[PDB]
Symmetry: C3
Subunit: 127 residues, 3 copies
């Protein structure tokens, strides 16, 4: 029901929500790195999570970094049984490099509800 969070390093930051009606929790870097121009990387968050059953955690793009620096968020699907560290793959769509300092909010964890019903095979999906 609640969102579980295991801290893996000193700096690690307990995911929180920027506001009441906020769609997601703030995922932040625990490392100083550089998302190279037209390049990509996996940033360290220093944390591992367990999204509530009946949902999966989506690593979603932060508006600011997107509009101003053209930072895209690759991958992003964290399954509810996954126990490893959350990595945030970042793609720099720009010709310019982009710098990340420990503590910067690099993304947001949205807890999206899904369904995992069984799969039946048919010959006709209509009607």
């Amino acid at each position: 029901s609640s969102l579980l969070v295991k801290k893996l390093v000193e700096s690690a930051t307990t995911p929180m929500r920027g506001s009441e009606g906020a769609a997601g929790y703030d995922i932040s870097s625990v490392e100083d790195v550089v998302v190279p121009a037209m390049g990509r990387i996996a940033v360290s968050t220093g944390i591992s999570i367990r999204v509530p059953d009946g949902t999966y955690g989506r690593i979603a793009p932060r508006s600011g970094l997107a509009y101003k620096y053209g930072i895209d968020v690759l991958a992003g699907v964290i399954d509810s049984d996954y126990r490893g560290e959350v990595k945030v793959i970042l793609y720099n769509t720009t010709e310019r490099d982009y710098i990340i300092k420990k503590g910067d909010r690099i993304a947001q964890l949205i807890l999206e509800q899904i369904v995992t019903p069984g799969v039946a095979v048919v010959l006709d999906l209509s009607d």
Copy 2:
């Protein structure tokens, strides 16, 4: 419960759904612009929204523009408490430019259900 929509300009178009089983509402441009090759922009929708509590609005990619012109949708997370204008950041993955005329469907607003439970810290997520 319903999807609220405040119109900000003349041209603004009340978000609607292309069909009964449609996943989202049609977000359209209220400006004539050009998403430059290997470039990006924030298109004006002329509208502000309030997605139903218990969800957030996702600006999602339209299939056609994606397959034919390689148009990607950056950012995209609209929180339920946000009151400003909805901007649709578009990334042109192609070497060719791409033109948008007022009224063109530039994306789709999907209302996705999420959860915002409190966050507990543990030492072990398993078991």
Copy 3:
């Protein structure tokens, strides 16, 4: 309620989930192709689906292909009334080409819950 699946070719593979807490079903290619460097394509899955009402199927990025080969997933929104073949548009963010063999897991189908309430127009979203 269940996830319907119509097989369109010999090779077609009945979508399954890699694990109990898995967020999505494994979508795989039924064709040998190459996502060109800084290029994109629509891969054939040999299948058509009908996601449960009250949800839409999201073609989501697979972590491995993202981190190691910089493969992004364009479009991705499959509506619940859609009856055609599921195509997986893939964008190669790298300078290197990328090869897909029949049977390779090219993505994952996440069944996300949404809402499609009516749309009301207001002058003020706040309060």
